[PDB]
């Protein structure tokens, strides 16, 4: 359409949907309860992402926020996505290592704060304050990464899959705050169509890429 | 008041409240933990519905959405209701059959998508796109119905209650997308006071009717 | 800033943050899973409260609501806080007594209704109706207090800590509806800077005060 970034929202919509369908199919047959648990969280992730990608594509998930002397296009639908899919991704990890729910509770609530403060920042109309929220959200992200490495004898099946996925997580996830900082939500350094591409590549990799590594491994089974 | 559908929102408010009070009373005495679990989910359902019915009655849960060349009255409070009560109803079913949480996870997330996409559609200002969201929401509903029948040796107590409730669920729930399609959110075929009546009858049956069948059966006990 | 209540929002921000940091530090070392579970819920509470306090301080968590012939400043961010932290506080209590999840389900859903109806009332533009929602929210609160005393052989460690915390809860929590009634959301009896102070003292006591009593006791351990 009339938004130059439309193409990347369309690609992302498409990629998230085919990823959802693929994992849906693959999960057909599965009766292993544990595996059952990874399939559900892992298919749901790009399915949610599919709908929020679509909502951005169709314009619904877009709003204008005034700040720094301009009317800025903010895709808020990203935070509706992440709010659910980021804890679910952390859920895949906790289960994979069989995390005490006390740690799961810390991960999921730290995540909510991360995203919730992400969202507040996205929509705050006082230019400098946006970066205050970014910082707090970053701190929660840094806490989550802390736990990923430091908050955790696992079955050797689980170990190599866990370490890979954790590696993929820290590298991908750590990129989100940077893109946010220099893109349209932040200093306005990198234009919106480029930011959206960046987020499209991270989003598909962190959900569909992450999911293919998880789901093709017997780490997930009994 | 000045809205012809006021009477059905008042009736629904009333019926949901007396249903809540009745189940509250009935749950008095109960110490069976399992039964405890069905009473809580089952009383909470029309209690939430009570407040959202009230919010529509009082006008709070109503908003105007512009599309197809008119200003359309959309009761958004329905989705605030369903968002919580529909997974809770699916929760009553999963527990009753002792569903693996992997399936519960699939049901509850598919439900969120259903309602969440329902809501997006309700509020989208591009007339044709509303039906895109309707379709996606319908697909999630069809998936849920799939699991209800196909996603599941149960204690014979549970079986006859389960089958009845599942039957009631598929027939009632399948009616919601139709009403949405031809009523005010959709093609505008059936007027708002009639749609609201339809939704009032489905809502009370699916929550209070469903609940009386559940709660008068020993299916729920130990 | 230009809002006389700014000082109490700043104090509260500060106190909630240092409380979060303190509990974070204290939870360092902890490997007891159960204790793990109380630390996470208990640190998360003022961390959420910290961000919502900040959001009010910075003006984001503030909105104008028209009613009774004036434009009223309503801090909605309080309900975004309570929505998560009040069930979490009830969670600390249920676990401490090892509540059946059927009761936990009743507590947490009754809480959601309480806060959710609190919020509807806060934002309703029909002056008299606000007090209808207040009443319904109060009823849910009274139900929760009912369960706290009546909805529940515990390990004697847990007992004296439980009774104290429950006492602190009933007295603090019962004060919130009163402040709401006579303050700016309600009859407008007590000015906003005074209400905000009241809420700041309750909030810190119910979260940080409550948490210090909980976390310095071996009630939380194995
Ligand atoms: C737990 C544990 C963790 C707790 C996290 C603590 C942090 C909480 C922060 C939250 C604050 C919410 C912000 C939002 C409610 C306020 C919206 O205000 C905006 C501008 O003032 C409105 O913009 C105009 C439009 C904007 C739209 C933004 C809305 C988005 C909503 C996405 C969520 C969805 C929920 C699924 C619904 C179906
Ligand atoms: C950061 C603390 C540790 C956490 C708590 C404090 C948060 C405060 C925000 C951090 C910084 C804020 C700076 C805002 C900015 C420099 C002030 C605005 O001045 C310029 C003209 O008025 C901005 O105009 C527009 C010109 C530009 C486009 C402005 C871009 C702003 C940049 C902000 C960069 C923040 C990082 C460098 C944070 C890395 C740590
Ligand atoms: C955006 C990409 C980075 C582009 C560059 C890609 C080239 C490689 C750099 C990424 C790095 C990949 C990490 C490799 C892993 C291998 C480690 O396996 C170990 C097994 O115990 C894990 O231990 C401990 C694991 C340790 C590894 C954790 C990595 C750290 C986080 C890396 C920085 C982040 C990326 C910031 C991106 C930029 C846009 C700000
Ligand atoms: C999980 C697992 C499943 C994930 C589901 C994925 C689908 C997510 C979709 C969600 C999107 C949310 C839409 C909404 C936030 C955006 C509102 O925009 C409207 C028009 O642009 C605002 O209308 C003006 C007024 C409108 C009001 C609508 C708000 C309603 C909110 C009801 C929820 C309540 C939450 C309880 C609060 C106490
Ligand atoms: C459906 C796919 C399988 C899923 C993905 C594609 C979604 C696309 C929506 C399905 C259809 C959409 C048709 C919209 C409509 C015909 C186009 C509007 O043309 C008319 C004049 O402009 C509408 O005006 C107003 C006149 C009327 C009041 C218009 C009513 C519209 C009707 C839409 C009916 C949708 C169903 C029949 C879906 C059943 C499957
Ligand atoms: C069937 C499956 C997905 C169907 C894809 C369709 C392809 C449409 O491509 C363009 C043809 O004009 C529509 O974009 C024209 C511009 C506008 C965009 C409309 C296309 C999207 C709104 C639809 C993308 C996904 C759809 C699927 C909706 C329901 C589906 C999940 C059953
Ligand atoms: C709105 C109402 C339908 C009005 C009509 C009412 C008259 C009866 C039609 C509804 C049907 C009721 C189903 C009966 C049940 C009995 C089946 O018990 C079996 C025991 O194993 C269940 O197996 C498998 C169970 C199978 C039964 C599932 C039913 C299917 C869904 C039926 C269509 C839906 C209703 C669409 C309503 C319309 C407004 C679009
Ligand atoms: C379960 C079990 C329990 C079920 C509880 C039943 C009661 C449900 C009631 C809910 C209703 C939600 C009200 C809200 C969605 C509607 C907002 O309308 C306002 C005025 O009409 C908008 O004001 C303009 C601005 C206002 C802003 C208010 C938004 C606030 C949102 C805070 C929540 C956050 C969610 C974390 C996001 C990250
Ligand atoms: C309460 C039932 C048991 C529950 C269901 C019914 C809910 C109805 C609300 C309860 C009461 C409502 C009274 C509203 C008020 C008296 C009517 C307004 O008249 C005055 C001038 O018009 C208000 O103006 C402005 C002047 C003042 C500033 C008005 C303040 C209003 C006061 C409301 C006080 C409510 C309590 C006393 C509830 C205690 C129980
Ligand atoms: C006590 C129990 C419920 C009380 C019912 C009351 C009956 C009021 O009927 C009409 C008399 O004018 C009020 O509608 C007049 C038009 C307006 C509607 C006001 C009535 C509703 C706002 C109240 C409906 C439920 C109330 C209950 C609020 C708190 C209750 C749960 C303790
Ligand atoms: C705002 C404060 C109250 C200011 C006044 C402070 C002075 C003391 C009054 C509060 C009271 C404190 C309760 C003491 C406790 C001791 C009881 O221990 C018992 C051990 O089994 C608990 O059994 C059963 C426990 C029973 C105790 C429950 C108390 C009840 C609730 C008390 C009223 C509330 C406060 C309303 C405040 C006002 C602003 C409306
Ligand atoms: C059945 C399988 C293997 C995959 C099909 C699912 C559908 C979606 C695309 C699959 C690709 C996943 C790769 C994850 C990681 C990334 C680094 C990809 C970045 C995305 C950008 C475009 C790349 C091309 C593709 C269209 C596959
Ligand atoms: C104690 C018991 C049995 C019930 C009282 C609870 C209060 C609410 C009404 C109970 C009725 C439930 C029937 C569920 C299914 C439906 C098909 C009903 C459709 C509703 C429309 C009006 C019907 C009349 C009533 C006011 C009972
Ligand atoms: C390490 C410890 C003991 C505490 C430091 C955490 C930081 C925050 C303040 C701690 C105080 C908690 C008291 C809870 C109950 C209340 C009745 C307090 C009402 C608050 C108002 C101001 C009181 C002064 C303070 C700044 C401590
Ligand atoms: C879609 C899946 C991913 C995995 C999205 C992850 C997003 C982060 C980890 C986002 C982080 C942010 C931070 C740390 C700073 C404020 C802005 C963000 C919300 C983008
Ligand atoms: C209140 C309890 C019920 C049981 C409500 C159920 C609603 C559905 C199952 C609603 C479905 C929708 C779909 C499938 C299509 C888009 C519009 C709806 C949200 C009405
Ligand atoms: C921050 C922790 C607390 C413990 C906040 C508690 C708030 C209540 C228990 C709030 C109750 C309300 C009621 C009962 C009546 C309507 C208005 C309120 C939402 C303030």
PDB file of C-alpha atoms and ligand atoms in Angstrom, chain A residues 63-65 76-77 79-81 83-84 105 108-117 119-120 123-125, chain B residues 79 83 112 115-117 119, chain C residues 44 47-48 51-52 60 62 76 80-81 84 88, ligand 1:
ATOM      1  CA  UNK A  63      -1.163   4.686  15.818  1.00  0.00           C
ATOM      2  CA  UNK A  64       0.182   8.240  15.635  1.00  0.00           C
ATOM      3  CA  UNK A  65       2.069   9.558  18.652  1.00  0.00           C
ATOM      4  CA  UNK A  76       1.649  -0.673  19.053  1.00  0.00           C
ATOM      5  CA  UNK A  77       0.528  -4.063  17.902  1.00  0.00           C
ATOM      6  CA  UNK A  79       3.575  -5.008  22.173  1.00  0.00           C
ATOM      7  CA  UNK A  80       0.262  -6.887  22.034  1.00  0.00           C
ATOM      8  CA  UNK A  81       2.237  -9.638  20.300  1.00  0.00           C
ATOM      9  CA  UNK A  83       3.218  -9.467  25.700  1.00  0.00           C
ATOM     10  CA  UNK A  84       2.067 -13.040  25.076  1.00  0.00           C
ATOM     11  CA  UNK A 105       7.237 -16.592  37.883  1.00  0.00           C
ATOM     12  CA  UNK A 108       7.252 -14.214  33.118  1.00  0.00           C
ATOM     13  CA  UNK A 109       6.728 -11.204  35.366  1.00  0.00           C
ATOM     14  CA  UNK A 110      10.035  -9.633  34.458  1.00  0.00           C
ATOM     15  CA  UNK A 111       8.895 -10.126  30.848  1.00  0.00           C
ATOM     16  CA  UNK A 112       5.603  -8.465  31.405  1.00  0.00           C
ATOM     17  CA  UNK A 113       7.378  -5.486  32.863  1.00  0.00           C
ATOM     18  CA  UNK A 114       9.769  -5.431  29.947  1.00  0.00           C
ATOM     19  CA  UNK A 115       6.988  -5.380  27.429  1.00  0.00           C
ATOM     20  CA  UNK A 116       4.637  -3.299  29.479  1.00  0.00           C
ATOM     21  CA  UNK A 117       7.322  -0.659  29.986  1.00  0.00           C
ATOM     22  CA  UNK A 119       4.713  -0.122  25.482  1.00  0.00           C
ATOM     23  CA  UNK A 120       4.521   2.828  27.816  1.00  0.00           C
ATOM     24  CA  UNK A 123       3.334   5.761  23.541  1.00  0.00           C
ATOM     25  CA  UNK A 124       4.746   8.438  25.889  1.00  0.00           C
ATOM     26  CA  UNK A 125       4.497  11.929  24.386  1.00  0.00           C
TER      27      UNK A 125
ATOM     28  CA  UNK B  79     -15.050  -9.237  24.116  1.00  0.00           C
ATOM     29  CA  UNK B  83     -11.829 -13.113  26.771  1.00  0.00           C
ATOM     30  CA  UNK B 112      -7.584 -15.911  23.111  1.00  0.00           C
ATOM     31  CA  UNK B 115     -11.680 -13.493  20.962  1.00  0.00           C
ATOM     32  CA  UNK B 116      -8.780 -11.197  20.338  1.00  0.00           C
ATOM     33  CA  UNK B 117      -9.343 -11.411  16.587  1.00  0.00           C
ATOM     34  CA  UNK B 119     -12.353  -7.832  18.933  1.00  0.00           C
TER      35      UNK B 119
ATOM     36  CA  UNK C  44       7.514  -8.367  41.499  1.00  0.00           C
ATOM     37  CA  UNK C  47       8.486  -3.662  40.936  1.00  0.00           C
ATOM     38  CA  UNK C  48       5.195  -3.366  39.057  1.00  0.00           C
ATOM     39  CA  UNK C  51       6.591   1.375  37.155  1.00  0.00           C
ATOM     40  CA  UNK C  52       3.014   2.444  37.641  1.00  0.00           C
ATOM     41  CA  UNK C  60       1.387   9.046  31.464  1.00  0.00           C
ATOM     42  CA  UNK C  62      -3.211  10.106  34.270  1.00  0.00           C
ATOM     43  CA  UNK C  76      -5.940   4.981  35.868  1.00  0.00           C
ATOM     44  CA  UNK C  80      -3.029  -1.418  35.879  1.00  0.00           C
ATOM     45  CA  UNK C  81      -0.927  -1.892  39.015  1.00  0.00           C
ATOM     46  CA  UNK C  84      -1.512  -7.724  38.762  1.00  0.00           C
ATOM     47  CA  UNK C  88      -0.070 -11.611  43.475  1.00  0.00           C
TER      48      UNK C  88
HETATM   49  C1  LIG D   1       2.419  -8.561  34.895  1.00  0.00           C
HETATM   50  C2  LIG D   1       3.014  -9.667  35.768  1.00  0.00           C
HETATM   51  C3  LIG D   1       3.491  -7.558  34.441  1.00  0.00           C
HETATM   52  C4  LIG D   1       3.035  -6.122  34.738  1.00  0.00           C
HETATM   53  C5  LIG D   1       3.587  -5.100  33.728  1.00  0.00           C
HETATM   54  C6  LIG D   1       3.676  -3.716  34.415  1.00  0.00           C
HETATM   55  C7  LIG D   1       3.706  -2.624  33.322  1.00  0.00           C
HETATM   56  C8  LIG D   1       2.250  -2.226  33.037  1.00  0.00           C
HETATM   57  C9  LIG D   1       2.184  -1.161  31.939  1.00  0.00           C
HETATM   58  C10 LIG D   1       0.853  -1.311  31.186  1.00  0.00           C
HETATM   59  C11 LIG D   1       0.294   0.064  30.840  1.00  0.00           C
HETATM   60  C12 LIG D   1      -0.766  -0.024  29.743  1.00  0.00           C
HETATM   61  C13 LIG D   1      -0.602   1.177  28.782  1.00  0.00           C
HETATM   62  C14 LIG D   1      -1.986   1.383  28.117  1.00  0.00           C
HETATM   63  C15 LIG D   1      -2.999   0.569  28.964  1.00  0.00           C
HETATM   64  C16 LIG D   1      -2.358   2.875  28.170  1.00  0.00           C
HETATM   65  C17 LIG D   1      -2.707   3.380  26.757  1.00  0.00           C
HETATM   66  O1  LIG D   1      -2.498   4.815  26.646  1.00  0.00           O
HETATM   67  C18 LIG D   1      -2.144   5.265  25.327  1.00  0.00           C
HETATM   68  C19 LIG D   1      -1.587   6.689  25.262  1.00  0.00           C
HETATM   69  O2  LIG D   1      -1.713   7.309  26.663  1.00  0.00           O
HETATM   70  C20 LIG D   1      -3.361   5.121  24.390  1.00  0.00           C
HETATM   71  O3  LIG D   1      -2.874   5.186  23.021  1.00  0.00           O
HETATM   72  C21 LIG D   1      -3.887   4.930  22.011  1.00  0.00           C
HETATM   73  C22 LIG D   1      -3.819   3.481  21.479  1.00  0.00           C
HETATM   74  C23 LIG D   1      -2.790   2.663  22.268  1.00  0.00           C
HETATM   75  C24 LIG D   1      -3.145   1.175  22.160  1.00  0.00           C
HETATM   76  C25 LIG D   1      -2.267   0.361  23.131  1.00  0.00           C
HETATM   77  C26 LIG D   1      -3.095  -0.839  23.638  1.00  0.00           C
HETATM   78  C27 LIG D   1      -2.317  -2.153  23.441  1.00  0.00           C
HETATM   79  C28 LIG D   1      -3.061  -3.296  24.146  1.00  0.00           C
HETATM   80  C29 LIG D   1      -2.444  -4.649  23.778  1.00  0.00           C
HETATM   81  C30 LIG D   1      -2.825  -5.736  24.796  1.00  0.00           C
HETATM   82  C31 LIG D   1      -3.944  -6.646  24.261  1.00  0.00           C
HETATM   83  C32 LIG D   1      -4.584  -7.462  25.394  1.00  0.00           C
HETATM   84  C33 LIG D   1      -5.311  -8.797  24.559  1.00  0.00           C
HETATM   85  C34 LIG D   1      -6.717  -8.234  24.307  1.00  0.00           C
HETATM   86  C35 LIG D   1      -7.605  -9.232  23.557  1.00  0.00           C
END
